[PDB]
Amino acid sequence: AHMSSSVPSQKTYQGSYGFRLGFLHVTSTYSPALNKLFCQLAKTCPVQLWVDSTPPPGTRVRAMAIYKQSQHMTEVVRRCPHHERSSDSDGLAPPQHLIRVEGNLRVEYLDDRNTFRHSVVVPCEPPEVGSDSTTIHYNYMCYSSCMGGMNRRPILTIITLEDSSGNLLGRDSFEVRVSASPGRDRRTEEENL
Ligand SMILES: *C[C@@H](C)C(=O)n1cc(C=O)c2ccccc21
Ligand SMILES: [Zn+2]
């Protein structure tokens, strides 16, 4: 219900370190033609992160969702009230956050004091040598159809690589549809282009 007075950039940017996302070829499936991830509710979505060169120490990877349509872009993407209130609040993620990271005890959940946007950050640990790729496991905690939240509006996930002093090192993004039938919905949306 909260309206921001800003919207993040969605410009794909590999930067100096060659940062970009990839998806491995069901509970989730990625459409290259649509650049769109289709997934089930609260199921693991593996996203591969790639670099061509090792970023400096202290980098972090941030994930944030925004609505894709301009008339909704200022609305903060969050869980619907029913899913927020019904949450066990047993883990690390605050119950209002749409995007969680699974399997990483160093994740931090952010609520921006000025923009009102939620995001989830994974701080990068010094990587073992020659290590050019890693997997982050994201979870989406509402359906795209949740009438009290996203309410059938498409969203984009924006993944940014940021250095320790906050400079943007890279950006990539993909559309998301969370539904009970990701494989069928991907087929349907792909057959309609
Ligand atoms: C999870 C961290 C912050 C990260 O983004 N990351 C770790 C490693 C380890 O080798 C990466 C390799 C390529 C991109 C991002 C990587
Ligand atoms: Zn919901």
Numbering used by the authors: 91 to 115, 122 to 289
The authors write:
However, the thermal stability was enhanced with a ΔTm of +3.563°C ± 0.002°C for KG6 compared with +1.4°C ± 0.1°C for KG3. Strikingly, the p53 Y220C–KG6 complex shows significant structural changes in L6, where the Cα position of E224 is altered by 13.2 Å relative to p53 Y220C-CL–KG3, whereas the overall fold remains similar (RMSD of 0.454 Å). The alternate binding mode of KG6 compared with KG3 positions the aldehyde of KG6 to form an H-bond interaction with the backbone amine of S227 instead of T150. Finally, an allosteric stabilization effect was observed as a result of the L6 movement, where the D228 carbonyl is shifted 2.9 Å, establishing an intramolecular H-bond with the backbone amine of V147 rather than through the small molecule itself. Our structural analysis revealed two conformational states of the covalently modified p53 Y220C, with the KG6-Y220C L6 state representing a novel druggable pocket.
The transcription factor and tumor suppressor protein p53 is the most frequently mutated and inactivated gene in cancer. The most frequent p53 missense mutations in cancer are found within the DNA-binding domain (DBD), where all mutations result in lower target gene expression through the loss of DNA-binding affinity. Structural characterization of these hotspot mutations revealed a druggable cavity in p53 Y220C, a mutation that indirectly inhibits DNA binding through the loss of thermal stability in the DBD. In this study, we identified the first covalent compounds that selectively react with the somatic cysteine in p53 Y220C to restore thermal stability to WT levels.
